[PDB]
Design a protein around this motif. Sequence first.
Motif: not given
Lengths: 59, 83, 208, 99, 99, 138
Positions: C19, C25, C112
């Motif tokens: 990820y 993702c 992220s």
Amino acid sequence: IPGEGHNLQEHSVVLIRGGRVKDLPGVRYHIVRGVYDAAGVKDRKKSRSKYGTKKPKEA
Amino acid sequence: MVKIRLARFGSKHNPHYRIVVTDARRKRDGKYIEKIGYYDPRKTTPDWLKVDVERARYWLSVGAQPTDTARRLLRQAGVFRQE
Amino acid sequence: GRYIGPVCRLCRREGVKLYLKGERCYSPKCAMERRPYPPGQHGQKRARRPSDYAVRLREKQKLRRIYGISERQFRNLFEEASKKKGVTGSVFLGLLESRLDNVVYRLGFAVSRRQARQLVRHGHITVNGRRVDLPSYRVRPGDEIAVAEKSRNLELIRQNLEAMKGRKVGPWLSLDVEGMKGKFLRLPDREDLALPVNEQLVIEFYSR
Amino acid sequence: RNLSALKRHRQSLKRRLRNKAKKSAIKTLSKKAIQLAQEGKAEEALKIMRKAESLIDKAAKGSTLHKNAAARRKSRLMRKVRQLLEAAGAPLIGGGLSA
Amino acid sequence: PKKVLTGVVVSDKMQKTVTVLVERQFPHPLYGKVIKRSKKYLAHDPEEKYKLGDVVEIIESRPISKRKRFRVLRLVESGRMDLVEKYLIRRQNYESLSK
Amino acid sequence: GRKERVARLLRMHANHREEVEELKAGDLGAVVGLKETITGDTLVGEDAPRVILESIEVPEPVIDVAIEPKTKADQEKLSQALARLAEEDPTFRVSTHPETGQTIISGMGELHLEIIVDRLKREFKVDANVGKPQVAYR
RNA sequence: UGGAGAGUUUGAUCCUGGCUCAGGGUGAACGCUGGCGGCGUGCCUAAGACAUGCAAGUCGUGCGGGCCGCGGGGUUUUACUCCGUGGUCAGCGGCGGACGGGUGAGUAACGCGUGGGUGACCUACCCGGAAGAGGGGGACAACCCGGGGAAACUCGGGCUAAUCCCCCAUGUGGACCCGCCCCUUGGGGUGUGUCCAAAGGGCUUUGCCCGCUUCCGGAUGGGCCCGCGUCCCAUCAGCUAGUUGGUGGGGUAAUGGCCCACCAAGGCGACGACGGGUAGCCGGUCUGAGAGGAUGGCCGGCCACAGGGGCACUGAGACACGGGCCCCACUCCUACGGGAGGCAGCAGUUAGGAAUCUUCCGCAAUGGGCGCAAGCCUGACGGAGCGACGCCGCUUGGAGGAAGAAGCCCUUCGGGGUGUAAACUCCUGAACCCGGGACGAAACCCCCGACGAGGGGACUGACGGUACCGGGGUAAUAGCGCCGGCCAACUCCGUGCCAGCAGCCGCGGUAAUACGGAGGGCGCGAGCGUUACCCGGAUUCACUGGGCGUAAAGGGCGUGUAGGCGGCCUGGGGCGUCCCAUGUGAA
Ligand SMILES: [Mg+2]
Ligand SMILES: [Mg+2]
Ligand SMILES: [Mg+2]
Ligand SMILES: [Mg+2]
Ligand SMILES: [Mg+2]
Ligand SMILES: [Mg+2]
Ligand SMILES: [Mg+2]
Ligand SMILES: [Mg+2]
Ligand SMILES: [Mg+2]
Ligand SMILES: [Mg+2]
Ligand SMILES: [Mg+2]
Ligand SMILES: [Mg+2]
Ligand SMILES: [Mg+2]
Ligand SMILES: [Mg+2]
Ligand SMILES: [Mg+2]
Ligand SMILES: [Mg+2]
Ligand SMILES: [Mg+2]
Ligand SMILES: [Mg+2]
Ligand SMILES: [Mg+2]
Ligand SMILES: [Mg+2]
Ligand SMILES: [Mg+2]
Ligand SMILES: [Mg+2]
Ligand SMILES: [Mg+2]
Ligand SMILES: [Mg+2]
Ligand SMILES: [Mg+2]
Ligand SMILES: [Mg+2]
Ligand SMILES: [Mg+2]
Ligand SMILES: [Mg+2]
Ligand SMILES: [Mg+2]
Ligand SMILES: [Mg+2]
Ligand SMILES: [Mg+2]
Ligand SMILES: [Mg+2]
Ligand SMILES: [Mg+2]
Ligand SMILES: [Mg+2]
Ligand SMILES: [Mg+2]
Ligand SMILES: [Mg+2]
Ligand SMILES: [Mg+2]
Ligand SMILES: [Mg+2]
Ligand SMILES: [Mg+2]
Ligand SMILES: [Mg+2]
Ligand SMILES: [Mg+2]
Ligand SMILES: [Mg+2]
Ligand SMILES: [Mg+2]
Ligand SMILES: [Mg+2]
Ligand SMILES: [Mg+2]
Ligand SMILES: [Mg+2]
Ligand SMILES: [Mg+2]
Ligand SMILES: [Mg+2]
Ligand SMILES: [Mg+2]
Ligand SMILES: [Mg+2]
Ligand SMILES: [Mg+2]
Ligand SMILES: [Mg+2]
Ligand SMILES: [Mg+2]
Ligand SMILES: [Mg+2]
Ligand SMILES: [Mg+2]
Ligand SMILES: [Mg+2]
Ligand SMILES: [Mg+2]
Ligand SMILES: [Mg+2]
Ligand SMILES: [Mg+2]
Ligand SMILES: [Mg+2]
Ligand SMILES: [Mg+2]
Ligand SMILES: [Mg+2]
Ligand SMILES: [Mg+2]
Ligand SMILES: [Mg+2]
Ligand SMILES: [Mg+2]
Ligand SMILES: [Mg+2]
Ligand SMILES: [Mg+2]
Ligand SMILES: [Mg+2]
Ligand SMILES: [Mg+2]
Ligand SMILES: [Mg+2]
Ligand SMILES: [Mg+2]
Ligand SMILES: [Mg+2]
Ligand SMILES: [Mg+2]
Ligand SMILES: [Mg+2]
Ligand SMILES: [Mg+2]
Ligand SMILES: [Mg+2]
Ligand SMILES: [Mg+2]
Ligand SMILES: [Mg+2]
Ligand SMILES: [Mg+2]
Ligand SMILES: [Mg+2]
Ligand SMILES: [Mg+2]
Ligand SMILES: [Mg+2]
Ligand SMILES: [Mg+2]
Ligand SMILES: [Zn+2]
């Protein structure tokens, strides 16, 4: 004298490096390409650092 | 003669002394007789200065001479104060 | 610097699904949906039985590529865990999860890990009121990772902080969405993190 | 081109000259006393010994001889003078020997 | 404190001086086996009362000469000529190790 | 393309040597430091446009002679010298005949090579013979 | 909380066994590439030679003068010449130049490390205590003149001052001989005899301040001694005349043959003397599972040296890095008769080498010498500078984004790879610009108070207008090694035992994953590799932890010296060993 082709003559100054060549008798050292009077290998592309050649620019 | 002075430690741009008794002849940071306290000229800690008034006094009574700033610091820890 | 380059390309090499991109993702395209094989002129050719070394190497890379960390900080982090009292296995992960950038992501503020890095790095994050821009900052139990003023009204932040409405943060943490604040409660553990990694193997890699 | 440690060298010589002259005296009189002491001459022996003792101690007060050195000589001198004398002596006008 | 050693006298060829041979054991720093080594000390015997064969206590002392830094403290026992026979043999043997 | 260090500047006076603190445009002087710089090279501030000024020139030598030491032992002593010499005068040159292994020393004139050799002896403590270069036949 | 092995002898096998590699490390060097910051760190070689500047000096509150300043006096911006103040220059005198800093040459040695000893000793300045500081003389520089000289500076005569030198006195005390008492290596006490002390200088004047003399004690720093520990060669086996000891002297602070006489012949050595080679030692550092091995740059301790060698002087302390004398080597100046020098101090030059810097800033801080103090000096030191040399941290962007542009590479011509990578859309905002701007510095000093304590007041920043903070703000560096096996990562082309690769095994003979290139990949990343060296792997010197019938290895066999090892029972001792306490084991 490593690499394909060299510019060494009966008076060139070289830098010795240590390290023998298995198929050669009294040969216990390697000339360092790209130092003093030993030009780097011409047109080399891959293992450049080991043959004293500078990174070629895409001109 | 024997003295009570600041021995530098800490680090560059980070002075951290050590109040110590040493002969006036050792280099500034060399072997010393006894450590009596510490001192941090930049008060990075509330506890930026400790002294062992007990020992400090002992050495004073036996000849040890305090350097000026060493005197300043000991005075402040109340060594010379006879109340 | 960090990696800075094709990420998904790594997800195919590790065989697993990393990820390193956040939102995408999850969509139907982490490339693990399309090209679930190794990148390269090959990739979709017969895979030779992995050597004992190739196993540990790939497993160890798997974990490191998950946090963005350099091989220097990774190994350093590792040796520290070894020294540490207790099952180096867990402890290691623990120290990795304590990393500041990570926590920010594990907190929501960032989609992220890479984004979290830039957030922390661009002074957007704040630990206990004082700003910190060192991704490697070790977060300790009790700290409060939050945002900052010029940082709050920010576009990307509101987005990321809205997605947190409803969403629950790992047991070892405790987000406060409407305050953009959050506390690091407890050091995590092997079970708390559903990592697709067998750390026992990373331990073994660092022997030789 | 020159430092002033030269003054120190100047000091050096003069002081050297000074106590150099004092040590001679001390050795001379000391020898002189013991020589007489062996010769049986109690009075003049002791007389000279007293002078020596003075000159030794006087050397001790300054940077010439100093301390135990002077203390030492005196003992050796007295030790020697007394012994030689009891070769049929008897100390006349007891000079510097409590006895 | 002043070091004190016990050895046997193996030489009284000198005036007011005897040669005491002291032994000692210890763990080998590497192979742990207890080994026995020995050293000879010249001990001062002013009254010349100690003779060849005595086992004596030797005590550290103010230098009496170059090499003599110990004084005989006291007699432990006498007549151990057996202990000397050894040393002498060990020494005699050398006359058979040259060329 | 080399970083040089100007340790101190100095003006050459008719009798002594003044050490100035600086030299502005249009002025001449000598600098102490700089181990690489040679005649003709351009010097620019450690930042300033890394341009390359004109000037230099350097005519090509007119006469060649072969030089060899007195004893094989003086070889490196001589070579080291010749090299040092070719550094102060871009008009003097040292080469090695590709075919016949000898070293060809070359300059701007008979007189030129004359003070060179002679300079080699007195200033470099190396005594060498000189003669007409060998010929590569076929 | 701590241990991984692989390739290579054969047709194949098991064993033996050597070679080789994967790891960690470095004061590094070399190659490629290169953005920042912080902290460290940088001549490992010629202990070669050094231009230049700077690295100890400081006191007029120890003393006499010289030259100048300013002012008031005869009289002057003609003060010159004549009290008096602040300076200055040397001299005399004192204290410090034995600290600090450098270097690793020499040394296998009580050099060092560790633990002790001194009834065998020293310790300037600093503390505590006791008692003094009363008289009398004298010289040499400075200075003037004279003589030598180009100069360095030298020589003669002549005054002259003191805290300079000398005599006398007082003797709290102390030293010495002797007798006695105690004690026990020369320590403590005591008696008669003899012997030994001193500077005055400054003020708010007998009252203070700094000095002077003697003695006792304390602290601190040392000298000397001793046990144990400290590399390789025995193809170095015998070494020894001040040699080993004694007696008496000399010497020193003190023991000692340390030195010298005389006497005696001893002293040392296979438990390795003597000789040769190498080496500064330690705390530590690197490696290792550990036990070991290797090492001793930086920092702290001792030591040793100061162009090579020898020697004393002065002094509390030196046989003295920037003091002295002589010899040797070497170099410089000269009016050619004699002058000068010693970077292993900082910085720098030159030489050597694969290779390691500014002839920088400042005494603001800490420390040091002197001074009552103001303060002066301090290339110790605090900082800055250059170098990826090392380590730690940071950046070259983040989120979207096609069954997926072009180019390039494969292609069974369908397509596959580079690759969400790019483009592209937003977002953030390294750099940069603007404003502000440190901590490190409170005291010496001054004021009330006693110059005490305590309270209060003022000055002071090299680093730096820097770190940091606020504000505005551009996306805006990527390289290097490897891709046959160990070993993580494959294809096409070129080439044809040619060119080359190579750590080992070995690749190259026309389909080469092993050469050169390309695409692609794996490893790392402000870097990556290489070489050299160390430990590991090497259980491959096996103490932990190997072996010798045929692999290397049982001595040809006895006898026997030293040495090593040694049955049963009981007692003594309690050296080994075990236990506890305590000291030490610096930082
Ligand atoms: Mg090699
Ligand atoms: Mg290659
Ligand atoms: Mg002086
Ligand atoms: Mg005479
Ligand atoms: Mg004797
Ligand atoms: Mg083979
Ligand atoms: Mg093998
Ligand atoms: Mg065979
Ligand atoms: Mg075969
Ligand atoms: Mg530096
Ligand atoms: Mg050196
Ligand atoms: Mg200076
Ligand atoms: Mg100066
Ligand atoms: Mg000095
Ligand atoms: Mg020193
Ligand atoms: Mg050395
Ligand atoms: Mg040496
Ligand atoms: Mg030797
Ligand atoms: Mg010892
Ligand atoms: Mg000791
Ligand atoms: Mg003195
Ligand atoms: Mg006193
Ligand atoms: Mg005159
Ligand atoms: Mg006269
Ligand atoms: Mg005096
Ligand atoms: Mg009196
Ligand atoms: Mg009296
Ligand atoms: Mg009396
Ligand atoms: Mg008197
Ligand atoms: Mg008087
Ligand atoms: Mg020993
Ligand atoms: Mg004697
Ligand atoms: Mg004596
Ligand atoms: Mg002798
Ligand atoms: Mg030897
Ligand atoms: Mg030798
Ligand atoms: Mg091992
Ligand atoms: Mg060691
Ligand atoms: Mg050094
Ligand atoms: Mg050191
Ligand atoms: Mg010497
Ligand atoms: Mg030298
Ligand atoms: Mg000399
Ligand atoms: Mg010398
Ligand atoms: Mg003296
Ligand atoms: Mg000196
Ligand atoms: Mg000397
Ligand atoms: Mg010396
Ligand atoms: Mg010097
Ligand atoms: Mg220097
Ligand atoms: Mg060179
Ligand atoms: Mg530097
Ligand atoms: Mg300056
Ligand atoms: Mg200062
Ligand atoms: Mg000061
Ligand atoms: Mg410094
Ligand atoms: Mg992207
Ligand atoms: Mg914007
Ligand atoms: Mg401040
Ligand atoms: Mg303040
Ligand atoms: Mg008052
Ligand atoms: Mg006060
Ligand atoms: Mg006050
Ligand atoms: Mg001041
Ligand atoms: Mg593989
Ligand atoms: Mg290969
Ligand atoms: Mg880095
Ligand atoms: Mg081993
Ligand atoms: Mg064994
Ligand atoms: Mg074996
Ligand atoms: Mg055979
Ligand atoms: Mg055999
Ligand atoms: Mg047999
Ligand atoms: Mg035989
Ligand atoms: Mg036997
Ligand atoms: Mg038994
Ligand atoms: Mg037995
Ligand atoms: Mg028994
Ligand atoms: Mg016992
Ligand atoms: Mg203990
Ligand atoms: Mg104990
Ligand atoms: Mg203890
Ligand atoms: Mg410790
Ligand atoms: Zn993905």
